[PDB]
Ligand SMILES: *[C@@H]1O[C@H](CO)[C@@H](O[C@@H]2O[C@H](CO)[C@@H](O)[C@H](O)[C@H]2NC(C)=O)[C@H](O)[C@H]1NC(C)=O
Ligand SMILES: *[C@@H]1O[C@H](CO)[C@@H](O[C@@H]2O[C@H](CO)[C@@H](O)[C@H](O)[C@H]2NC(C)=O)[C@H](O)[C@H]1NC(C)=O
Ligand SMILES: *[C@@H]1O[C@H](CO)[C@@H](O[C@@H]2O[C@H](CO)[C@@H](O)[C@H](O)[C@H]2NC(C)=O)[C@H](O)[C@H]1NC(C)=O
Ligand SMILES: *[C@@H]1O[C@H](CO)[C@@H](O[C@@H]2O[C@H](CO)[C@@H](O)[C@H](O)[C@H]2NC(C)=O)[C@H](O)[C@H]1NC(C)=O
Ligand SMILES: *[C@@H]1O[C@H](CO)[C@@H](O[C@@H]2O[C@H](CO)[C@@H](O)[C@H](O)[C@H]2NC(C)=O)[C@H](O)[C@H]1NC(C)=O
Ligand SMILES: *[C@@H]1O[C@H](CO)[C@@H](O)[C@H](O)[C@H]1NC(C)=O
């Protein structure tokens with residue numbers, strides 16, 4: 001067999017007569033080195049689970065990067081930071097490096113205060129551009145907490161009121177597109 | 188940005204069309220994405236192969252675009268059915284369905300057109316200023332138990348009134364505000380008071 | 386056999402005979418609704434042409450199919466997040482139940498959050514989480530252990546702890562304030578008086594509650610216990626939700642299995658094609674493979690779009706039920722469980738919600754003679770709110786949905802017209818206080 | 819993000835991108851232990867032809 005990937009020390013126990021591991025899709029998962037009787041796991045070397053959080057380019061050009069389901073020590077080896085541009089190595093190590101249950105967040109300043117979610121990141125973490133100004137990551141708030149002074153012989157009754165006009169927008173129709181099939185395909 | 192939902196839709200369609208246009212720049216494995224160049228450069232024996240590749244690619248692009256349009260049109264039709272129901276039960280009447288016509292209790296709605304959409308102005312009533320009161324589920328008057336017809340019994344500390352439950356409008360408790368039923372050895376938390384008789 | 390539609394039951398209809406219930410039951414039913422899918426994401430470049438420069442260059446000829454597929458999947462995930470947000474995040478604040486549980490004798494300990502727990506989930510929530518097995522998935526189970534092959538499962542935006550907190554806030558608001566917390570600021574109210582409101586909302590006088598309060602509370606608790614037993618007994622109850630998961634898994638599985646297909650090429654292995662044939666024909670073979678895999682991805686994406694439309698419809702329905710069912714009191718028949726609706730309680734579940742619909746069901750029915758009106762002094766008297774009934778000798782006026790006879794008085798009935806018009810009017814005496 | 823969206827300006831939000839960052843890749847070849855050697859020794863260095 002031939003392929004491309006990263007060879008790592010494995011944890012599996014191949015049988016004495018089996019050579020190549022295999023997943024349910026007939027795809028190599030682990031191999032036995034032909035010379036040394038050691039099992040090597042083949043982890044492909046490519047990362048497509050990278051999200052780029054950005055405020056609008058009108059407001060700023062500072063961005064954050066989220067790598068999916070990785071530790072913050074495995075980031076410069078998962079994306080091969082050593083073989084990248086030095087301006088990409090800013091977003092692989094550093095001081096603004098949070099570790100969410102979704103992965104590694106870089107370029108976002110982790111704060112403790114909670115706020116309403118602005119740019120959703122995941123696992124309860126949302127980011128936003130705030131104050132001198134920078135990108136911050138926080139556990140989004142579900143709303144201000146409250147306690148109802150409930151008792152079996154107490155009722156709260158309103159004495160004033162407000163007439164509130166809210167706005168609900170609903171799409172009704174699309175654009176009536178028409179395609180000339182023969183002219184499009186065979187103009 | 189308030190009407191983003193509409194713009195998005197429009198934008199999406201545009202993007203679709205745009206992508207379709209850019210799909211004319213693909214070879215799909217042929218030797219050129221331009222039909223005229225293939226016809227000017229190759230004889231039918233191999234022009235047939237090249238044009239077959241182009242036809243397959245462009246037909247796949249068209250099918251993808253049409254399927255996306257069909258699914259998005261199904262979505263928009265569902266939303267339009269929802270909007271029609273909203274106009275039926277929201278402008279032309281008065282819905283008691285909670286939150287179906289804006290947050291709070293629904294008073295009325297006003298529709299306004301918009302490019303490829305509608306905008307409902309939901310006029311609703313929202314309680315603002317509130318006060319604590321001591322309350323009782325019922326009141327004894329002569330051993331018999333009295334329950335309020337419409338509203339609840341409340342007390343400002345010394346006296347007992349009967350008030351509707353959405354606006355503090357305390358009224359003297361009388362035999363035209365309350366109805367009798369059984370006796371007041373069963374209700375839990377009932378309190379003693381007098382029921383003025385007109 | 387020829388299936389039977391149901392049990393035959395002829396109604397003893399008669400123009401002067403009515404059937405009025407004399408007793409009731411507090412029934413808790415279960416309604417399961419899906420709310421979100423698994424936010425699947427596929428790395429199209431790595432899926433089609435995993436770590437192969439020549440394959441990537443060839444695939445780049447096909448334009449922006451790969452880009453638009455990725456965009457569609459991103460839209461799907463965003464739509465699922467929006468669905469969950471709109472279904473659950475409908476409360477402005479986060480209420481919490483007080484330590485005192487003096488809820489008129491009703492016992493909510495099986496739906497309120499458990500204090501001695503890190504997840505702040507209720508007993509029923511724990512049952513639901515433990516009744517959703519993942520051993521029949523395959524790809525969704527092997528990816529949760531870490532199937533790194535360009536396919537990833539993004540985590541939901543709202544963690545299960547947040548969903549539990551949202552359900553806790555909704556439940557505490559409903560218990561301690563009724564419907565006021567949905568319209569605006571939460572206005573406290575004793576729970577018994579809230580149930581009195583609901584009974585008035587279904588045309589049952591409030592005293593009916595107060596005269597049978599403890600029994601109703603016991604029935605509610607008993608009903609909750611029965612729900613526990615159902616959850617303990619039948620695992621298949623949440624089938625729908627499981628099915629959704631299964632379907633997605635199957636889709637993914639199918640997609641994954643498509644990597645083993647030649648699609649007309651000489652071999653499903655790209656490297657063998659590259660090493661074996663000359664570039665002029667290896668190009669045709671790799672074009673065949675690229676077309677096949679792109680078609681497979683397109684089919685998967687279309688199926689995902691359709692299933693996500695289904696799930697969005699279900700989530701919109703669930704949001705409407707939460708608005709009209711929890712935050713208020715609906716009068717829509719069978720919209721919130723069979724019977725007349727009293728209230729509902731939400732409960733989280735993996736990628737879904739479970740509503741416990743507490744409803745009122747008439748149980749013990751009696752035959753009474755009836756009349757459309759009664760003739761007292763040549764005038765015709767109609768009931769203000771209720772119906773005239775007769776136990777054989779005397780005529781009373783009772784509410785329609787619960788037999789509670791009351792003497793006929795000028796405060797129960799209103800006068801209109803005379804006795805020469807109404808068809809079926811009877812003679813009796815209207816007592817004047 | 820800018821090129822993957824085919825625009826010079828980017829709106830607020832979290833976009834999911836591709837993977838354009840390539841990395842140089844070395845080559846390795848592995849085969850079992852060389853065994854089963856012919857009789858070429860006694861064929862070339864044979865006593866008599
Ligand atoms: C609660 O409200 C009632 C009526 O609103 C108050 O009754 C007052 O009673 C005195 C003597 O009985 C009268 O002179 C006043 O005119 C009454 N008030 C009004 C507004 O008519 C009662 O005092 C109030 N109690 C508390 C504790 O606020
Ligand atoms: C309301 O008033 C009645 C009296 O009219 C109270 O009934 C008395 O209750 C006490 C003990 O609770 C008994 O010793 C008396 O014999 C009862 N009197 C009568 C005439 O039955 C009743 O308790 C009062 N309610 C409250 C809540 O205090
Ligand atoms: C309404 O039905 C309930 C249940 O059938 C009745 O409650 C039962 O009452 C009897 C004695 O009256 C007890 O032995 C049973 O254990 C009770 N059942 C339960 C489930 O607790 C109730 O009495 C009926 N009420 C009317 C007015 O018919
Ligand atoms: C509400 O019902 C639960 C049952 O689910 C009660 O919990 C039981 O309480 C008894 C005595 O208090 C214990 O012996 C059991 O071990 C408890 N079981 C569980 C599962 O907790 C609870 O006490 C009830 N609450 C009230 C106020 O009656
Ligand atoms: C119909 O109901 C009325 C009232 O509930 C009954 O009238 C009373 O019946 C009780 C016994 O059930 C007697 O002790 C009372 O003296 C009756 N009151 C009067 C004013 O006569 C009536 O008997 C019931 N009729 C039937 C056929 O059940
Ligand atoms: C190959 O040789 C090495 C050392 O000579 C030995 O350790 C290993 O087990 C051998 N493997 C096979 C497959 O013969």
Ligand SMILES: *[C@@H]1O[C@H](CO)[C@@H](O)[C@H](O)[C@H]1NC(C)=O
Pocket residue numbers: 069070071531
């Ligand atoms: C990250 O580190 C934790 C230890 O805190 C470990 O359990 C986990 O497996 C690591 N992640 C991976 C992908 O190995």
Ligand SMILES: *[C@@H]1O[C@H](CO)[C@@H](O)[C@H](O)[C@H]1NC(C)=O
Pocket residue numbers: 110111112
């Ligand atoms: C947040 O609080 C934790 C303690 O819970 C503390 O260790 C950490 O330094 C704080 N970080 C910030 C940014 O305030």
Ligand SMILES: *[C@@H]1O[C@H](CO)[C@@H](O)[C@H](O)[C@H]1NC(C)=O
Pocket residue numbers: 159160161316
């Ligand atoms: C209710 O609020 C409005 C506006 O805030 C105010 O003008 C009015 O006086 C208030 N009414 C009462 C009874 O407080």
Ligand SMILES: *[C@@H]1O[C@H](CO)[C@@H](O)[C@H](O)[C@H]1NC(C)=O
Pocket residue numbers: 149317318319
């Ligand atoms: C009602 O009583 C509670 C209990 O302390 C208090 O917190 C709240 O402010 C009171 N509200 C009003 C309107 O008096």
Ligand SMILES: *[C@@H]1O[C@H](CO)[C@@H](O)[C@H](O)[C@H]1NC(C)=O
Pocket residue numbers: 152153375376377487
């Ligand atoms: C409220 O509960 C307390 C104890 O929790 C009790 O002493 C009191 O009588 C109850 N009052 C009502 C009206 O239920």
Ligand SMILES: *[C@@H]1O[C@H](CO)[C@@H](O)[C@H](O)[C@H]1NC(C)=O
Pocket residue numbers: 397750751752
């Ligand atoms: C009512 O009467 C019909 C026949 O007149 C009988 O079949 C039915 O069982 C009766 N129901 C009750 C509750 O008495």
Ligand SMILES: *[C@@H]1O[C@H](CO)[C@@H](O)[C@H](O)[C@H]1NC(C)=O
Pocket residue numbers: 760761762763811812
């Ligand atoms: C009912 O009363 C009217 C007069 O009020 C009388 O004319 C009629 O005959 C009576 N019918 C019966 C069945 O008693």
Ligand SMILES: *[C@@H]1O[C@H](CO)[C@@H](O)[C@H](O)[C@H]1NC(C)=O
Pocket residue numbers: 400401808809810
């Ligand atoms: C019921 O039907 C019978 C039979 O036709 C008739 O004599 C009687 O007047 C009717 N009564 C009413 C109230 O319709």
Ligand SMILES: *[C@@H]1O[C@H](CO)[C@@H](O)[C@H](O)[C@H]1NC(C)=O
Pocket residue numbers: 858859860862863
């Ligand atoms: C023949 O013998 C010579 C040395 O005597 C050796 O170098 C050579 O490899 C041998 N030939 C073969 C085919 O083994």
